[PDB]
Design an enzyme around this catalytic site. Sequence first.
Site, PDB file in Angstrom:
ATOM      1  N   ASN A 100      25.979  15.941  43.833  1.00  0.00           N
ATOM      2  CA  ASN A 100      26.250  14.868  43.193  1.00  0.00           C
ATOM      3  C   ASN A 100      28.178  15.154  42.005  1.00  0.00           C
ATOM      4  O   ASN A 100      28.785  13.638  41.939  1.00  0.00           O
ATOM      5  CB  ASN A 100      25.773  15.207  41.733  1.00  0.00           C
ATOM      6  CG  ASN A 100      26.121  14.468  40.437  1.00  0.00           C
ATOM      7  OD1 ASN A 100      25.932  13.072  40.384  1.00  0.00           O
ATOM      8  ND2 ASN A 100      27.002  14.744  39.209  1.00  0.00           N
ATOM      9  N   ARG A 158      23.925   7.801  36.104  1.00  0.00           N
ATOM     10  CA  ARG A 158      24.313   8.315  37.496  1.00  0.00           C
ATOM     11  C   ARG A 158      26.149   7.647  38.210  1.00  0.00           C
ATOM     12  O   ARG A 158      26.179   8.453  38.338  1.00  0.00           O
ATOM     13  CB  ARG A 158      23.388   7.025  37.491  1.00  0.00           C
ATOM     14  CG  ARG A 158      21.929   7.576  38.541  1.00  0.00           C
ATOM     15  CD  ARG A 158      20.765   7.773  37.058  1.00  0.00           C
ATOM     16  NE  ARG A 158      19.899   7.994  37.728  1.00  0.00           N
ATOM     17  CZ  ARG A 158      18.335   6.664  37.828  1.00  0.00           C
ATOM     18  NH1 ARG A 158      18.808   6.461  37.728  1.00  0.00           N
ATOM     19  NH2 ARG A 158      17.378   7.469  38.330  1.00  0.00           N
ATOM     20  N   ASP A 197      20.661  19.817  43.566  1.00  0.00           N
ATOM     21  CA  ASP A 197      21.201  19.958  41.658  1.00  0.00           C
ATOM     22  C   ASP A 197      21.551  18.454  41.169  1.00  0.00           C
ATOM     23  O   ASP A 197      22.036  17.879  41.942  1.00  0.00           O
ATOM     24  CB  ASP A 197      22.779  20.908  41.880  1.00  0.00           C
ATOM     25  CG  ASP A 197      23.415  20.770  40.418  1.00  0.00           C
ATOM     26  OD1 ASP A 197      22.414  21.969  40.071  1.00  0.00           O
ATOM     27  OD2 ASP A 197      24.269  20.511  40.477  1.00  0.00           O
ATOM     28  N   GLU A 233      16.354  18.831  41.566  1.00  0.00           N
ATOM     29  CA  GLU A 233      16.103  18.893  40.689  1.00  0.00           C
ATOM     30  C   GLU A 233      16.476  18.083  39.179  1.00  0.00           C
ATOM     31  O   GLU A 233      17.144  16.720  39.138  1.00  0.00           O
ATOM     32  CB  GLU A 233      17.343  20.134  39.648  1.00  0.00           C
ATOM     33  CG  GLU A 233      17.666  20.011  38.168  1.00  0.00           C
ATOM     34  CD  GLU A 233      18.790  20.645  37.836  1.00  0.00           C
ATOM     35  OE1 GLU A 233      20.055  20.634  38.068  1.00  0.00           O
ATOM     36  OE2 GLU A 233      19.213  21.719  36.229  1.00  0.00           O
TER      37      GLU A 233
HETATM   38 CA    CA Z   1      26.429  10.904  39.664  1.00  0.00          CA
END
Ligand code: CA
Length: 496
Positions: A100, A158, A197, A233
């Site tokens: 991420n 996000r 993750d 997760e």
């Molecule tokens: Ca993100």
Amino acid sequence: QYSPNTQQGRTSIVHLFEWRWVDIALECERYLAPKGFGGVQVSPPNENVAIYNPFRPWWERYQPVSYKLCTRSGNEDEFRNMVTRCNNVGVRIYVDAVINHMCGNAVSAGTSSTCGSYFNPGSRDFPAVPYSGWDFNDGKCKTGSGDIENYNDATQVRDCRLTGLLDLALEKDYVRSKIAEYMNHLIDIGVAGFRLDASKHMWPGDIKAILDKLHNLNSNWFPAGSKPFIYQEVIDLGGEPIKSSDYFGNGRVTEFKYGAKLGTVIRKWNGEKMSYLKNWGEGWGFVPSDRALVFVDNHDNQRGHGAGGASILTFWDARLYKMAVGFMLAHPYGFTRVMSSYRWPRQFQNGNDVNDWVGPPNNNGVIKEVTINPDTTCGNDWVCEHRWRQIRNMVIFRNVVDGQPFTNWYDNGSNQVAFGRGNRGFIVFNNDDWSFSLTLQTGLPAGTYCDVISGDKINGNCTGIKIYVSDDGKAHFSISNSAEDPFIAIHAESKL
Ligand SMILES: [Ca+2]
Ligand SMILES: *[C@@H]1O[C@H](CO)[C@@H](O)[C@H](O)[C@H]1NC(C)=O
């Protein structure tokens, strides 16, 4: 992406938190394989930022600098060696995939990385990948600070930085391809799956686009058409705009309500009692069993760094922890992951551990080897919960009763309950402040069984408590609330 890809019979994976690749390879051969463990969650295998203030914290590994397999756990050759040896004994490897983000934006540019790669957080340059300013969500995030400020806004969760971590623009095909390149390298090496993750901080659709680029598992060890095991997760407790169910199309999800609620029940908080566990599972509002990855504690929340908070049970609460892990391993719900930790000097101040950052046992930053004591326990400060007789034997218990139905439940309306798994296993718990002494129907075939919590079945005899099951399946259990381990478990393979 829902199947663990473990070999027939093995039903749990263990998280060997911060272990070196060489120690894991050995552990696969000397312990994991022989004892029936299905696989291992390894810590991020990719290069991360070397943080010296505080001195090399565990969390520096969730701060990527490149995708080179070069960390404090070992180099690429050692990693490959570990995957090969473990696979050769039937123990799978699952990689913790930190996709991420990259490192903190405030981190100083230079070559303070676990592999010497150069990086410059300020200018968004990670030449080792490579990534540039064009590959981050800076322009997309709409918050004034650039970080996530409100979790009630699913967009911001996000597209913005999780506490400063530079957020990758996962919708760009270039970024998706650089991540897939990394993951396919691991798959072809032999890994069986991934823990994604911080999946909550990524769009379900972006994750799917990446998974579409993944290879099938290595055909030298897995059957053709094997897809990597994927567990996401996603911390989903009380109402938030984001739901863990939004990720079912990509694979399994971590069910954090599982450990949190089990902790409050075992601790008897809020008037909760074990008798309420009668309908444990989906009946409690958890995700469907075939999409759940369950656990009592994880590396984050065992040190108060996450969901569950104060109720979470860990090795620090040994007696209750073993009981919680026992219940989890005996209950049919979900796919289970066992935790394996290291000790750190907990130092509470105003209810908070000021040393929750302390990294793994080390000598000047160099992680210490896992030493095995004459009694199979570990030294050098590694806790090795997976080696505790009580836990190791329940891992085996799960394998033995696999597929068997939940049945023969009993409870005294308070905290002493019992249930079996078909005709292959039976477990009894006493968490009340008084002794338990009663004859229960076990559904097991007549015979003499070794209690696997207090002892083992060693060549014709039991080293601990012995239970006698009669022809009608009944057996008498006696557990003092003063017992070291207030629970008894017996199964088809502990029968004399
Ligand atoms: Ca993100
Ligand atoms: C079990 O242990 C006893 C001694 O405590 C011994 O007499 C017996 O033969 C042992 N049984 C087996 C099968 O080894």
